[PDB]
Design a protein around this ligand. Structure first.
Ligand SMILES: Nc1nc2c([nH]c(=O)n2[C@H]2C[C@H](O)[C@@H](COP(=O)(O)OP(=O)(O)OP(=O)(O)O)O2)c(=O)[nH]1
Ligand SMILES: [Mn+2]
Ligand SMILES: [Mn+2]
Length: 329
């Protein structure tokens, strides 16, 4: 099995959900303690299990797989032998993990903020609301809509949001396109948000598109929050999704890319996070090129690769093309 997640297909549905879940809990906890290497190691190990053709029912199947150190093996062994791992259940039961999970999953809260808050004695969502001076407006919006934002976004939500986003961008700029990116492009049936990458075939026509799109969405009562970040023109939003009788808040990321950058932006925003990380490490270490969401830079030559498609980027990196549904690392 190749070393980099970008060299191997990782389908949406795989055979070792319980095992990788457990290693991802440890990665996540390692992340919560600012232990980046450990996170990456647990994350790489988890994606190895996702890439396996068969369910791992005996530890004998774990013998001789890459990035798969003694710690990850031990976790898998305990799960196979006793149906549970004590280190995993300890993390799962710990107030520290539970709280960090609680805080970091709130819109606009990363690890640093969550940790700070933890250290200052905050534990619950109601604690945060008793301290509104401590919250950005984004985080306040995240808290106001936390229940809805903890509700998985379904494919049918995505279709409805794509329609309104397409309407608003078509109305704002004819010819402008909307591409579903993120997990839903990779085949996921649920998600934490919907990611859209917006562009226009004529370079430069996308200029000031986002605010036009935003005004239109806003004018229809569809926007609960947005924050224009002007890096790509982007807005990480909360939409008011109408539903039969009800409505629900849904996280939407709108990203505008100029068409020359669109392939890179698509590749980057499609993920998975680990897949992209793996692809960027691969590009750096194995090919001496710096990949990001804007381009593929050669630092020796000081050049940028021109791509018309994601296929071009893969081809240029010496990798077999992986469609999005096989990037679920
Ligand atoms: N270049 C760039 N990429 C980003 C940013 N934020 C961000 O999520 N991405 C990328 C990382 C991943 O490769 C991809 C997926 O993002 P995501 O957080 O919505 O996660 P996801 O769609 O895979 O899964 P889900 O949890 O939404 O279902 O988008 C950013 O600020 N800049
Ligand atoms: Mn997403
Ligand atoms: Mn997103």
């Amino acid at each position: 099995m190749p070393a980099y997640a970008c060299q191997r297909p990782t389908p949406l549905t795989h055979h070792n959900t319980g095992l990788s879940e457990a290693l991802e809990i440890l990665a996540e906890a390692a992340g919560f303690e600012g232990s980046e290497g450990r996170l990456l190691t647990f994350c790489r190990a988890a994606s190895v299990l996702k890439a396996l053709p068969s369910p791992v029912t005996t530890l004998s199947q774990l013998q001789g797989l890459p990035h798969f150190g003694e710690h990850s093996s031990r976790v898998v062994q305990e799960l196979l032998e006793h149906g549970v791992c004590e280190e995993v259940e300890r993390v799962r039961r710990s107030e520290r993990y539970q709280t960090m999970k609680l805080f970091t999953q709130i819109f606009g809260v990363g690890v640093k903020t969550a940790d700070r808050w933890y250290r200052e004695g905050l534990r619950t969502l109601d604690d945060l609301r008793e301290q509104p001076q401590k919250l950005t407006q984004q985080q306040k919006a995240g808290l106001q809509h936390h229940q809805d934002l903890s509700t998985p976004v379904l494919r049918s939500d995505v279709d409805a949001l794509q329609q309104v986003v397409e309407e608003a961008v078509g109305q704002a700029l004819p010819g402008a396109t909307v591409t579903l990116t993120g997990g839903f492009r990779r085949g996921k049936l649920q998600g934490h948000d919907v990611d859209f990458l917006i562009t226009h075939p004529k370079e430069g026509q996308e200029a000031g598109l986002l605010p036009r799109v935003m005004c239109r969405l806003q004018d229809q009562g569809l926007i609960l929050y947005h924050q224009h970040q002007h890096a790509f023109e982007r807005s990480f939003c909360i939409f008011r999704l109408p539903q039969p009788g009800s409505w629900k808040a849904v996280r939407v990321d709108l990203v505008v890319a100029p068409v020359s950058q669109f392939p890179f932006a698509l590749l980057g925003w499609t993920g998975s996070k680990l897949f992209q990380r793996e692809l960027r490490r691969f590009s750096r270490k194995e090919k001496g090129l710096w990949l990001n969401s804007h381009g593929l830079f050669d630092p020796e030559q000081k050049t940028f690769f021109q791509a018309a498609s994601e296929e071009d980027i893969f081809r240029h990196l010496g990798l077999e093309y992986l469609p999005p549904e096989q990037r679920n690392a």
